[PDB]
């Protein structure tokens, strides 16, 4: 929901760095 918005935005950084 609305709150997940800030939490989702974090995954942006996740997708910014590499994790295998």
Q: Which two tokens stand for residue 4?
A: 């997940």
Provide the 10 A C-beta neighbour count for residue 17. Answer: 6
Distances (CA, A) of 14 to 2, 8: 20, 10
Dist CA 16 CA 2 (whole Å): 23
- Comparing CA positions, the residue from 4, 1, 20, 2 lying closest to residue 12 is 4
């Amino acid at each position: 929901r609305q709150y997940m918005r800030q939490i989702e935005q974090a995954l942006r950084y996740g997708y910014r760095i590499s994790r295998r």
